[PDB]
Design a protein around this ligand. Structure first.
Ligand SMILES: Cc1ccncc1NC(=O)Cc1cc(Cl)cc(N[C@H]2C[C@H]2C(F)(F)F)c1
Ligand SMILES: Cc1ccncc1NC(=O)Cc1cc(Cl)cc(N[C@H]2C[C@H]2C(F)(F)F)c1
Lengths: 304, 304
C-alpha cells in the first residue's frame, strides 16, 4: 500500500543526455542514434530572442558552430537542420546507450516523467501532467532547456516532451520531439497567454479509486448519480466533461474496488459541493488531478 | 521556477537490481561488488514468519538454495551470511555496473529516493522521508521487498534503506544496508506499534523558503518571533524542536530570500494558529514537511 507521485526509472534516458553549446549558449540535448535533438533557441543571443527569424539565424550558423558533448568526450556535428522548433544535429557517432524508443505527441490530461538536466547532467526526476491548456507544472531553472519528458512501456521509451521555456507567468512550455509546441506558445520573448485551465475529471476519479484501494473511503456515500447530472456539476466546478470512454478507462479501478463509476462520480459531486472539511485524501487536502487511470493501475498492480 | 517532489536519477541504482529466489519466495536484491544484499525473510515460508528463529532457518539453507538473477542471466552464490536482518550472498561475478557507493544509516527527518522494484525489475522512483518515528510512507506491494532507498552525492550513491515490510497499520519499515532496522520494528508477523510521529519543523520552514523562492509570499507577515516562543507553539502543534543548528542549516534559504529565520518562524507560528483558510502554498492546502533544507537548496540551485 501507499500511493505516491512516482516517476519512471530514469536510467534509459540518462544515457541519452548530452550538453549542447552554440556560442555562449549552453543547454541540454537528446542523443538518439546519430542525431542530437535540442531547442532551436540555442542559436540565439539575448538580443535575438525578442523576435528571432530562426531561418536567418540558422543560415548564419554552420555545423562547426555547434559543440555536442557526451560526458567528458566531444562528438562531431556533421549536419544541422531545423524541424519546427528543434535543432537536429547529425553527429558522427551513434549513441551506444540508445534504448528502444518512440516519439509520441501526448494528449492533454496525460502524464509523463521529466528528467531535469543542467549542462547535460541529470539532477532529478519527477512526474507531471500535460494540463488541458497544454502547459506543464515542472521544476525548471536556467540551463534546463532540452530536458525531456518521457513514458516507459516495458523497455521502450516514448519521448513526449522537450522543455523550451518558462513564460513570465511561470508557465512551462515546450514541444514534442518533432519541435511542435504544445499549445499556442512560440519561442519568442513576448507576453503569451495560456488560456483557461480545467480539472482533469477522469484523473480525479482515478485518484479517488487509488484512495479507496489504499483505505481512504470516508468520501464514499450512500448516493449515486447519472453522467448528465454529474457533468452539470463538473461544468460548474470547471472540470473536463466525463465521457463513457473515460468510464471505460476507469473500469479496471471500478473492478478492483467494487465501486461503480457513477457511485464514485456521486462521491466526487458531494466533494465539490460540500468541500472536504479539512479532511485529507491520500495525504492531500485537495482533489488531485495529475494521476491518470493508467498511473493508478500501474502503481497499484506493480507494472515494471 | 516550480517546486516538485523530485527523486534522484535512478540509473546508477537500476544496474544494481537483481532477483533473489529461495524456494518459492521471490524478492529483490542489491548487487554491489561480489555481494548481493536482500532481506533475510527470503529464507522463510508463510508458517515461518509468525516467530522465525533465523539462525536455525539459515542453517537449514545452503548456498545452492539461493537463486540470484541479474536480468536474463543467472549468478552463482558461493557464500551466504546473516548481518542482522540482511542476507549477504557472495556471488562468483562482481557487478560490472557497480557505481561508486557508500552505506549510510540516515537520521530521522532526512529524505531519500526509493527505486520500487518487482522481480528484480524497476517499476518507479519516488522521494520520501524517514519520519521522526523511523517509519516511511512509500508505495510498496507484494514483491517490493529488497527495494532500496538512496541519495546521490554527485556520482557516489549512498544506500540508506532496504524495504522489509508493511505492518497491518500500513507503516513501511525496513533496514539500513547493514540489516539494522530503523525504529523498533522486527521481521516477525506480530502487531507492532510505531510510536507518536511528529512534524519535521526544519523541513516545513525549508518548504516555506521554497514557496517564497517560487512566488508564494502571502503567509509572510509583519510579525517576528523568538526561538523559545516559537518552540512553545511548535510543542502545542506537535512539531520537532527547532535548534540554532536548524537555523544554521536554513541559512542558505535565508540568504537567497532575504527573510530571517525568526521572521519565517513567525509566519509559520500564525499558519499553525490561524490555519491557512483554504489557501494553498506550492499547490498544497497543508504544511509539507518532507523536503529537507538540502533538497530545497539542490532543487532551487540546479545541483546535478
Ligand atoms: C530561464 C528558464 C527557466 C525555466 N525554464 C526555462 C528557462 N529558459 C527560458 O525560458 C529560455 C528563454 C526563452 C525565451 Cl523565448 C526568451 C529568453 N530570453 C533571455 C533572457 C534570457 C533568460 F534566459 F534569462 F531568460 C529565454
Ligand atoms: C506484502 C507487502 C506489501 C508492502 N510492503 C511489503 C510487503 N511484504 C511484507 O510485509 C513481507 C512480510 C513481512 C512479515 Cl514480518 C510477515 C509476512 N507474512 C506473510 C503473509 C505473507 C504476506 F506477504 F502476504 F504478507 C510478510
Amino acid at each position: 500500500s501507499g500511493f505516491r507521485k512516482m516517476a519512471f526509472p530514469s536510467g534509459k534516458v540518462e544515457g541519452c543526455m548530452v550538453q549542447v553549446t552554440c556560442g555562449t549558449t549552453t543547454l541540454n540535448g537528446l542523443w538518439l542514434d546519430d542525431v542530437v535533438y535540442c531547442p532551436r533557441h540555442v542559436i540565439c543571443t539575448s538580443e535575438d530572442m525578442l523576435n528571432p527569424n530562426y531561418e536567418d539565424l540558422l543560415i548564419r550558423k554552420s555545423n562547426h558552430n555547434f559543440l555536442v558533448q557526451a560526458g567528458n568526450v566531444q562528438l562531431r556535428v556533421i549536419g544541422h537542420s531545423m524541424q519546427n522548433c528543434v535543432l537536429k544535429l547529425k553527429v558522427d557517432t551513434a549513441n551506444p546507450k540508445t534504448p528502444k524508443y518512440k516519439f509520441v505527441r501526448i494528449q492533454p490530461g496525460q502524464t509523463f516523467s521529466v528528467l531535469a538536466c543542467y549542462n547535460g547532467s541529470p539532477s532529478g526526476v519527477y512526474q507531471c501532467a500535460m494540463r488541458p491548456n497544454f502547459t506543464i507544472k515542472g521544476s525548471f531553472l536556467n540551463g534546463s532547456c532540452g530536458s525531456v519528458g518521457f513514458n516507459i512501456d516495458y523497455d521502450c521509451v516514448s519521448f513526449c516532451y522537450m522543455h523550451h521555456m518558462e513564460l513570465p507567468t511561470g508557465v512551462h512550455a515546450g514541444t514534442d520531439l518533432e519541435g511542435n509546441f504544445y499549445g499556442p506558445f512560440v519561442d519568442r520573448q513576448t507576453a503569451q497567454a495560456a488560456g483557461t485551465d480545467t480539472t482533469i475529471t477522469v484523473n480525479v476519479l482515478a485518484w479517488l479509486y487509488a484512495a479507496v484501494i489504499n483505505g481512504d473511503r470516508w468520501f464514499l456515500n450512500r448516493f449515486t448519480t447519472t453522467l448528465n447530472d454529474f457533468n452539470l456539476v463538473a461544468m460548474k466546478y470547471n472540470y473536463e466533461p466525463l465521457t463513457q470512454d473515460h468510464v471505460d478507462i476507469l473500469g479496471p479501478l471500478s473492478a478492483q474496488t467494487g465501486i461503480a463509476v457513477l457511485d464514485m462520480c456521486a462521491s466526487l459531486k458531494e466533494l465539490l459541493q460540500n468541500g472536504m472539511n479539512g479532511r485529507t485524501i491520500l495525504g492531500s487536502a485537495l482533489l488531485e488531478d495529475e494521476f491518470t487511470p493508467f498511473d493508478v493501475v500501474r502503481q497499484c498492480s506493480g507494472v515494471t
